[PDB]
Amino acid sequence: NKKFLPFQQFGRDIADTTDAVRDPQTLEILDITPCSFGGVSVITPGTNT
Amino acid sequence: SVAYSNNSIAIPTNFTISVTTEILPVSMTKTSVDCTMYICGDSTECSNL
Ligand SMILES: *[C@@H]1O[C@H](CO)[C@@H](O)[C@H](O)[C@H]1NC(C)=O
Ligand SMILES: *[C@@H]1O[C@H](CO)[C@@H](O)[C@H](O)[C@H]1NC(C)=O
């Protein structure tokens, strides 16, 4: 929902990476949310139980 | 230069109840850091190395 000037293409975050973009073919404001959510947690009781 | 005597003394006659506030840290921010998503962002040869 930001204010992209027509030359402004790349939104940067505080972490200085790519945040918000625009298609060079069609003028449109986009937002990016990265994939690879978290890790694997395993719950188990005692094996003898 | 607080005075001092041989046969005289100073005894309090009235008091004051003061509230003192201490601040102690207890919990650091718990942090889990994955290594592969940190180092090798979307790669195979990086993980093989
Ligand atoms: C207590 O100390 C003072 C300090 O000079 C002295 O003059 C006095 O004689 C002392 N008291 C006694 C009982 O000696
Ligand atoms: C003791 O001190 C308080 C303030 O510190 C005062 O308001 C009060 O009247 C005093 N009382 C006596 C008996 O000296």
φ/ψ region of A16 (left if φ > 0, alpha if ψ in -120 to 50, else beta) reads: left
A20 contacts A29 by C-beta, under 8 angstroms:
yes
Structure tokens, A15: 């972490």
Q: How far is A34 from chain B (nearest CA, A)?
A: 11
- Residues of chain A in contact with residue B32, where contact means CB-CB under 8 angstroms, are 39
Whether chain B has a CB inside 8 Å of the CB on A25: the answer is no
Distance, CA of A19 to CA of A8 (rounded, Å): 13
A23 contacts A36 by C-beta, under 8 angstroms:
no
Whether chain A has a CB inside 8 Å of the CB on B34: the answer is yes
